[PDB]
Design a protein around this ligand. Sequence first.
Ligand code: ATP
Ligand code: ATP
Ligand code: MG
Ligand code: MG
Ligand code: MG
Ligand code: MG
Lengths: 73, 73
Amino acid sequence: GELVGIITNRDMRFEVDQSKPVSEVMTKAPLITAKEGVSAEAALGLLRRHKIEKLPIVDGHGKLTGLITVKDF
Amino acid sequence: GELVGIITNRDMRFEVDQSKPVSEVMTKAPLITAKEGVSAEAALGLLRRHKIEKLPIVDGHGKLTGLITVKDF
Ligand SMILES: Nc1ncnc2c1ncn2[C@@H]1O[C@H](COP(=O)(O)OP(=O)(O)OP(=O)(O)O)[C@@H](O)[C@H]1O
Ligand SMILES: Nc1ncnc2c1ncn2[C@@H]1O[C@H](COP(=O)(O)OP(=O)(O)OP(=O)(O)O)[C@@H](O)[C@H]1O
Ligand SMILES: [Mg+2]
Ligand SMILES: [Mg+2]
Ligand SMILES: [Mg+2]
Ligand SMILES: [Mg+2]
């Protein structure tokens, strides 16, 4: 149940072999994340600083709880 | 006249201040470039390897001579 990476459209658009496993293509941990209870301003600041469209939200143990996107804002 | 960087939509979409100079927002050199006379297959291989959409083409002296894009293929 541990968050070991994230795979988005950019990674997959440049790959031709569709049979390849996700572990070979994904952006591996550590990721840019935030804790549960992160404010909207802080989340958008983290998104804009690291020039990424997605921000996973994790609990105290690091297991994934949610996801915040720039598209929603 | 030296190629010192590149500034694309990903760099400009995450900057809130429009009065900032290019030098602060651009991706700085060294960039991913190819020589003059590079084949189409090599250019597409570089583009898909480095997960970028733009490939400057330079001469022997490093001057900017052209640009190849994935959108063209
Ligand atoms: N929270 C994150 N931490 C680390 N890397 C991330 C994170 N979110 C996305 N990435 C990586 O950033 C890169 C850019 O993907 P991003 O999610 O910003 O756009 P996209 O939706 O894939 O592409 P498009 O520009 O076509 O909309 C990808 O390689 C992705 O794996
Ligand atoms: N040839 C290159 N060498 C190095 N970095 C590059 C190069 N081309 C673009 N970049 C950088 O990589 C990121 C993505 O640029 P790219 O040109 O691939 O897409 P984009 O047109 O900005 O994105 P989108 O179409 O998703 O809005 C940007 O931060 C940009 O500055
Ligand atoms: Mg996207
Ligand atoms: Mg997008
Ligand atoms: Mg573009
Ligand atoms: Mg694009």
